[PDB]
């Protein structure tokens, strides 16, 4: 008759197509592509007849066979595509074959496929919306937002975005190269540790850790291949399949590098190691350009030429090309998309090259935003206006006549994304003001920042600027919030739910392409709820414990205990740093004595 039904020993069961060290700071060391993942089983029958063959199968498909030699046996064989399957052993004669209960494997692929999906509830203020527009609804997500801001990948709203932005993949090279990053502690040599061995001019990642190897909701375990937030991406890619994550390379710091790719091969170096990273995180579609600024006046007043529209241009031509050619291996549709100043000077010239460059890019995302801060105390103004204030008509740098200036040179409407901000700027000692106009005064210097000098988040304008010592005006010319305290000249200029309707309705009558949004952590719901709707789419008794009292700035491992507010705590995994509650790494596990 058969052979008996086999047992499958107790074995590893989590495999990888592409292995991640975890200790690894450089990303040479940290990544190894494989065409397949190397699966092992090992199974007994200690009582009768072994067969003489033996298969393994997964999800009924055979993917092994091999002699029965006796009582134990073991097979290595190639598993191809990501997945969890249920693995059987067989043993056969010519009688028929007699298959093993299943024991369920998991192969690891950077596509998510062995993930389940991150599909999280809406957090603070966020509604659910249907994604009819037809627009572009976009927002940046940070690396480093998952330290102090506390912002990981489970937290973003997710279903009310088409296009995810990563901020930001960095561009390797030391001094001369990426001297702007020099300007943040720690930031130059951490990318020089990540680029250790590794070409100038490749791309990276700039923190190894918070992208691939911290602990994270549903990528905890030490031996889950991909943690931090390309883990937790992934995860997400596989509940919001039609999510455009894209890669954002570049943004204020890590621009530099750019200027030096009017060198072919440079910029050829560039593309293709653009192309390899692409190949190795297969959940990523495409590639979001932020040079700022081609021609220069960025961060690096030593950089900048007349030639960088030309090489902005030949950059977004090789980039498609190259996706092109990646679309050829792979079937799969990539978007190229760049973000492009949205006015400053000599802004019209480089606008004739972006209306050559359109018909390689997918979208152009208009940074309408940082028209006016602290980087200026004697010119005050809106930060993200749709148009001009009253008091000043003239005014150059406007949302609208960013649009109007790109229309003017062809760029086809379609592929203008408005930029909506997530933060104010701001001053304080505003002085000097006429007609209770803070704006037409001057200021002693940067409002008192959430994280940085300057600069306020959203939520905490929300949350703690917009009333009390605090006056809260909209201007209804500009289509500009601003929250204005007397007694100290604080001035912040943001944006709120009315002027990000402003921006989305202006879309809808100039038939743009939609509205993007810096950055998603800083939000509390009110501007991505207003960004969806403005564009069309429309809704939808524990045991006394004792332990000692939460330590802010400590880090703890798995399995801390720590009594805060009242109830005793337990991290569910590692690397925890933030206060018990504010996500969903702590459990409440205990009371405490009252």
């Avoid at 200690?46 to 063959?53: A, F, L, P, Q, Y």
């Avoid at 950059?315 to 760049?338: I, N, P």
């Avoid at 933030?578 to 790494?585: E, T």
Wanted: charged share 20%; glycine share 10%; aromatic share 12%.
């Amino acid at each position: 008759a058969a052979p008996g039904k086999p047992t499958i020993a107790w074995g590893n069961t989590k495999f990888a197509i592409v292995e991640v060290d975890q200790a690894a700071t450089a990303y040479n060391n940290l990544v190894k592509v494989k065409n397949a993942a190397d699966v092992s089983v090992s199974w007994n029958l200690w009582n009768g007849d072994t067969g003489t063959t033996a298969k393994v199968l997964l999800n009924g498909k055979e993917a092994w066979s091999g002699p029965s030699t006796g009582s134990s046996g073991t097979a290595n064989f190639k598993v191809n595509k990501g997945g969890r399957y249920q693995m059987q052993v067989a043993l056969c004669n010519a009688d028929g074959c007699t298959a093993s209960d299943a024991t369920e494997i998991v192969v690891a692929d950077t596509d998510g496929s062995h993930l389940a999906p991150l599909k999280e509830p809406l957090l603070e203020k966020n509604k659910p919306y249907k994604q009819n527009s037809g627009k572009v609804v976009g927002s940046y997500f940070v690396e480093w937002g998952v330290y102090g801001r506390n912002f990981t990948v489970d937290k973003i709203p997710a279903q009310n975005l088409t296009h995810l932005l990563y901020g930001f993949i960095p561009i390797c090279g030391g001094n001369g190269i990426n001297d702007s990053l020099k300007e943040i502690e720690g930031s130059f040599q951490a990318l020089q540790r990540s680029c250790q061995g590794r070409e100038d001019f490749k791309v990276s990642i700039h923190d190894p850790f918070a992208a691939l190897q911290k602990a994270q909701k549903g990528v905890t375990a030490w031996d889950d291949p991909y943690k931090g937030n390309f883990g937790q991406l992934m995860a997400l890619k596989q509940a919001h399949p039609d999510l455009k994550i894209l890669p954002s390379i570049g943004g204020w710091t890590l621009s530099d590098p750019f200027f030096f790719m009017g060198d072919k091969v440079k910029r050829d170096r560039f593309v293709g190691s653009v192309k390899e990273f692409l190949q190795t995180w297969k959940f990523f579609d495409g590639v979001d350009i932020d040079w700022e600024f081609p021609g220069g006046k960025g961060a690096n007043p030593n950089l900048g030429s007349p030639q960088d529209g030309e090489t902005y241009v030949l950059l977004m031509k090789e980039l498609r090309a190259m996706l092109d050619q990646l679309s050829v291996e792979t079937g799969r549709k990539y978007e190229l998309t760049s973000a492009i100043s949205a006015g400053k000077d000599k802004i019209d010239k480089f606008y004739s090259f972006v209306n050559v460059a359109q018909n390689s890019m997918d979208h152009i995302f208009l940074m309408s935003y940082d028209f006016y801060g602290a980087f200026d105390l004697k010119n005050l103004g809106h930060q993200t206006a749709l148009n001009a204030p009253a008091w000043k008509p003239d005014t150059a740098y406007t949302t609208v006549n960013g649009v109007n200036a790109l229309l003017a040179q062809g760029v086809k409407p379609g592929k203008i994304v408005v930029g909506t901000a997530m933060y104010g700027r701001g001053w304080t000692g505003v002085n000097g003001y006429q007609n209770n106009i803070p704006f037409t005064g001057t200021a002693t210097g940067p409002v008192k920042g959430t994280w940085e000098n300057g600069i306020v988040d959203y939520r905490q304008i929300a949350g703690q600027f917009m009333s009390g010592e605090w006056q809260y005006t909209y201007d209804a010319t500009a289509e500009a919030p601003y929250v204005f305290k007397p007694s100290t000249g604080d001035l912040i200029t943001f944006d709120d739910a009315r002027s990000v309707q402003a921006k989305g309705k202006y879309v809808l009558d100039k038939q743009l392409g939609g509205l993007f949004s810096w950055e998603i952590d800083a939000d509390n719901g009110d501007i991505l709820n207003s960004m969806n709707a403005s564009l069309g789419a429309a809704d939808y008794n524990l045991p006394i414990m004792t332990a000692p009292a939460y330590v802010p700035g400590t880090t703890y491992a798995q399995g801390a205990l720590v009594s805060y507010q009242g109830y005793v705590w337990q991290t569910k995994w590692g690397y925890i740093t933030s206060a018990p509650g504010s996500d969903s790494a702590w459990l409440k596990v205990g009371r405490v004595a009252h």
